[PDB]
């Protein structure tokens, strides 16, 4: 059909959950859903309700836009969000290292 | 289970405002993504939760950010340096961001384990 393919979003939810050291039973107790229901959402592309989607992504900090919208500079991916969290306390001199390397990644692409 | 329920109304209004900014009627949207214009009215005006399918169809049609209403906004220390950095990495793929992330982690190792 022309059903939305939730598989990539479900796998991103599973990845975040595992990277953050959480079991499905923890996630289940936290947002009040059944662990088995979480398996099908993560592993099999079963669509959760909007309520369950909101609860998982707000609990884990997973970008929905990444998977719903065409990739653009108006979309902050999960990775980008996590990066920003990491650099929150950075000084400017830290940031100048950061900026320099972003430029190097750009120039790298022409090499 | 009310202090438990997501209030969709702010996202519903964003969808509605994007539809209007784009000059689309409810009948046009409904014809485009195959939903009853009456279900649309309820979704935009009365906080009725669409299915994930219909949520996806709306915001991909209209280019509406869900993250804006689902995820906590930070964007606090608008450091001019930080501003410039974030604008340069707007168009980075995640592979590129893996490098950026390793820089960040290298910098904390330095700062931390250096002192």
TrEMBL record, chain A:
<dbReference type="InterPro" id="IPR010982">
    <property type="entry name" value="Lambda_DNA-bd_dom_sf"/>
</dbReference>
<dbReference type="Pfam" id="PF18430">
    <property type="entry name" value="DBD_HTH"/>
</dbReference>
<protein>
    <submittedName>
        <fullName>Transcriptional regulator, HTH-type Tn916-like,CTn6-Orf6</fullName>
    </submittedName>
</protein>
<feature type="domain" description="HTH cro/C1-type">
    <location>
        <begin position="13"/>
        <end position="67"/>
    </location>
</feature>
<dbReference type="InterPro" id="IPR041511">
    <property type="entry name" value="DBD_HTH"/>
</dbReference>
<dbReference type="Pfam" id="PF01381">
    <property type="entry name" value="HTH_3"/>
</dbReference>
<dbReference type="InterPro" id="IPR001387">
    <property type="entry name" value="Cro/C1-type_HTH"/>
</dbReference>
<dbReference type="GO" id="GO:0003677">
    <property type="term" value="F:DNA binding"/>
</dbReference>
């Amino acid at each position: 059909e022309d059903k939305y393919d939730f598989r990539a979003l479900g796998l991103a939810i599973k990845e975040a959950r595992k990277k953050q050291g959480l079991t499905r039973e923890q996630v289940g107790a936290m947002i009040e859903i059944d662990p088995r229901y979480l398996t099908n959402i993560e592993n099999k592309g079963q669509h959760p309700s909007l309520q369950v989607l909101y609860d998982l992504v707000s609990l884990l900090n997973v970008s929905v836009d990444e998977f719903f919208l065409p990739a653009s500079s108006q979309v902050k991916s999960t990775k980008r969000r996590q990066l920003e969290n990491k650099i929150d306390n950075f000084t400017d001199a830290d940031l100048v290292i950061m900026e320099s390397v972003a430029d190097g990644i750009v120039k790298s692409k022409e090499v």
